[PDB]
Amino acid sequence: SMNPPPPETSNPNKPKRQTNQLQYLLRVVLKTLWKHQFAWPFQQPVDAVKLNLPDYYKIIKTPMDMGTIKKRLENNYYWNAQECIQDFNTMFTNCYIYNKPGDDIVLMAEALEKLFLQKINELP
Numbered sequence: 001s002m003n004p005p006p007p008e009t010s011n012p013n014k015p016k017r018q019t020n021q022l023q024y025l026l027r028v029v030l031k032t033l034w035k036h037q038f039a040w041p042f043q044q045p046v047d048a049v050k051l052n053l054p055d056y057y058k059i060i061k062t063p064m065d066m067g068t069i070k071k072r073l074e075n076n077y078y079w080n081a082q083e084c085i086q087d088f089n090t091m092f093t094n095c096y097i098y099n100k101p102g103d104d105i106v107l108m109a110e111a112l113e114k115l116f117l118q119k120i121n122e123l124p
């Protein structure tokens, strides 16, 4: 079995722009979620080979994770904050789609998402 290539994190043809909102997303949002006790499964792409989840990438067609988001913020991949917010939302939704309500992993994602939304309420 094999994992897919990770989501794109570098593309010199994509126009980039630093904004104070993107800086907040890195300095506050990403860095706070990263240290949460439930962040670890989300700090890198799902390794479906290591976890023996052969259907994962048959079902999840837009993978996303905070390791990828961290790379996208630290080597600025984005034009606007909404693109980054969308990446977080894709990460959460993938987990809810692949797993069952009330599963441990879903409860972990829900805790991260609650925190994420609280921080987004203070986006500058």
Ligand SMILES: Cc1nnc2c(N[C@H](C)C(N)=O)cc(-c3ccccc3Oc3ccccc3)nn12
Residues within 6 Å of the ligand: 040, 041, 042, 046, 047, 051, 053, 094, 095, 098, 099, 103, 104, 105
């Ligand atoms: C993201 C994302 N979305 N779904 C899953 C997922 N699903 C499987 C079917 C499941 N038993 O819940 C597992 C993991 C995952 C990643 C790295 C290391 C261990 C992992 O297993 C965990 C399982 C429960 C809680 C914590 C970790 N990450 N993950």
